[PDB]
Design a protein around this motif. Structure first.
Motif, PDB file in Angstrom:
ATOM      1  N   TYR A  90       1.081  -0.835   0.062  1.00 53.85           N
ATOM      2  CA  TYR A  90      -0.006   0.089  -0.311  1.00 53.85           C
ATOM      3  C   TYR A  90       0.777   0.925   0.153  1.00 53.85           C
ATOM      4  O   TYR A  90       1.458   1.983   1.432  1.00 53.85           O
ATOM      5  CB  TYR A  90      -0.613   0.175   1.220  1.00 53.85           C
ATOM      6  N   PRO A  91       0.451   2.130  -1.328  1.00 53.40           N
ATOM      7  CA  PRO A  91       1.715   3.505  -1.052  1.00 53.40           C
ATOM      8  C   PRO A  91       1.264   4.487   0.224  1.00 53.40           C
ATOM      9  O   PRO A  91       2.629   4.840   0.700  1.00 53.40           O
ATOM     10  CB  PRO A  91       1.380   3.815  -2.369  1.00 53.40           C
ATOM     11  N   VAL A 144      -4.673   5.016   3.228  1.00 56.33           N
ATOM     12  CA  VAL A 144      -5.587   6.079   2.637  1.00 56.33           C
ATOM     13  C   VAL A 144      -6.368   4.872   2.258  1.00 56.33           C
ATOM     14  O   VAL A 144      -5.897   3.996   1.680  1.00 56.33           O
ATOM     15  CB  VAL A 144      -4.853   6.888   1.525  1.00 56.33           C
ATOM     16  N   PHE A 145      -7.542   5.170   2.521  1.00 57.32           N
ATOM     17  CA  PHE A 145      -8.550   3.944   2.225  1.00 57.32           C
ATOM     18  C   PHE A 145      -9.329   4.473   0.779  1.00 57.32           C
ATOM     19  O   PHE A 145      -9.560   5.612   0.833  1.00 57.32           O
ATOM     20  CB  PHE A 145      -9.713   4.552   3.479  1.00 57.32           C
ATOM     21  N   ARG A 146      -9.196   3.812   0.007  1.00 57.45           N
ATOM     22  CA  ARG A 146      -9.732   3.878  -1.649  1.00 57.45           C
ATOM     23  C   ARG A 146     -10.493   2.239  -1.832  1.00 57.45           C
ATOM     24  O   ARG A 146     -10.281   0.944  -1.562  1.00 57.45           O
ATOM     25  CB  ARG A 146      -9.018   3.395  -2.533  1.00 57.45           C
ATOM     26  N   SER A 147     -11.965   3.110  -2.172  1.00 61.18           N
ATOM     27  CA  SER A 147     -13.484   1.597  -2.023  1.00 61.18           C
ATOM     28  C   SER A 147     -13.638   1.074  -3.951  1.00 61.18           C
ATOM     29  O   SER A 147     -14.269   2.385  -4.455  1.00 61.18           O
ATOM     30  CB  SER A 147     -14.020   1.329  -1.576  1.00 61.18           C
ATOM     31  N   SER A 148     -13.380   0.076  -4.204  1.00 59.46           N
ATOM     32  CA  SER A 148     -13.331   0.065  -5.417  1.00 59.46           C
ATOM     33  C   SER A 148     -13.544   1.089  -6.371  1.00 59.46           C
ATOM     34  O   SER A 148     -14.496   1.877  -7.649  1.00 59.46           O
ATOM     35  CB  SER A 148     -15.483  -0.073  -5.967  1.00 59.46           C
ATOM     36  N   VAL A 149     -12.041   1.083  -6.711  1.00 57.92           N
ATOM     37  CA  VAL A 149     -11.936   1.677  -7.605  1.00 57.92           C
ATOM     38  C   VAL A 149      -9.742   1.866  -8.236  1.00 57.92           C
ATOM     39  O   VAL A 149      -9.812   0.530  -7.972  1.00 57.92           O
ATOM     40  CB  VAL A 149     -11.359   3.671  -7.393  1.00 57.92           C
ATOM     41  N   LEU A 150      -9.577   2.416  -9.256  1.00 62.28           N
ATOM     42  CA  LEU A 150      -8.981   1.950  -9.948  1.00 62.28           C
ATOM     43  C   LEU A 150      -7.393   3.374  -9.916  1.00 62.28           C
ATOM     44  O   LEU A 150      -7.648   3.760 -10.715  1.00 62.28           O
ATOM     45  CB  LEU A 150      -8.681   1.572 -11.243  1.00 62.28           C
ATOM     46  N   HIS A 151      -6.821   3.077  -9.495  1.00 66.98           N
ATOM     47  CA  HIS A 151      -5.698   4.537  -8.677  1.00 66.98           C
ATOM     48  C   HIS A 151      -4.385   4.019  -9.924  1.00 66.98           C
ATOM     49  O   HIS A 151      -3.325   2.759  -9.323  1.00 66.98           O
ATOM     50  CB  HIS A 151      -5.306   4.340  -7.578  1.00 66.98           C
TER      51      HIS A 151
END
Lengths: 49, 35, 49
Positions: free
Chosen positions: B24-25, B28-35
């Motif tokens: 994990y860079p 930060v929480f991210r949900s159902s996304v392409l980062h």
């Protein structure tokens, strides 16, 4: 310690079966897929193919 | 504080890392996304 | 207007069902704008509007 190792008494040291790997990082753009709980379930390297 | 006795030297091998090595860079929480 | 560990923003904090990981603190969306925060003292996730 080979001196006090089970079945071995000769002076010296013996290492039990152990395997490890080493790699080096490089600056690469990555596309990380975050799932519904926010866990990274997959990734794509933007310079592989 | 003495060098190990009776070390056998062999050339190191290489193996395929596949996709291992992803972290994990940032925290930060991210949900159902392409980062 | 709020300040969570230096994260300064303005909005209406509320209760959220989002499940952060034990190490995750902030929350973001597709537009890379903050939308959720983990309270430093108590362990619950609050949305930002």
């Amino acid at each position: 310690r080979s001196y006090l190792t089970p079945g071995d008494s000769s002076s010296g040291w013996t290492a039990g079966a152990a395997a490890y790997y080493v790699g080096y990082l490089q600056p690469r753009t990555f596309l990380l897929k975050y799932n519904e709980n926010g866990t990274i379930t997959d990734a794509v390297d933007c310079a592989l193919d | 504080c003495v060098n190990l006795t009776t070390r056998t030297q062999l050339p190191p091998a290489y193996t395929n890392s596949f996709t291992r090595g992803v972290y994990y860079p940032d925290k930060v929480f991210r949900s159902s996304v392409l980062h | 207007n709020f300040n969570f560990n230096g994260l300064t923003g303005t909005g209406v904090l509320t209760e959220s069902n989002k499940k952060f990981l034990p190490f995750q603190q902030f929350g973001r969306d597709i537009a890379d704008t903050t939308d959720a925060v983990r309270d430093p003292q108590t362990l619950e996730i609050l949305d930002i509007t």
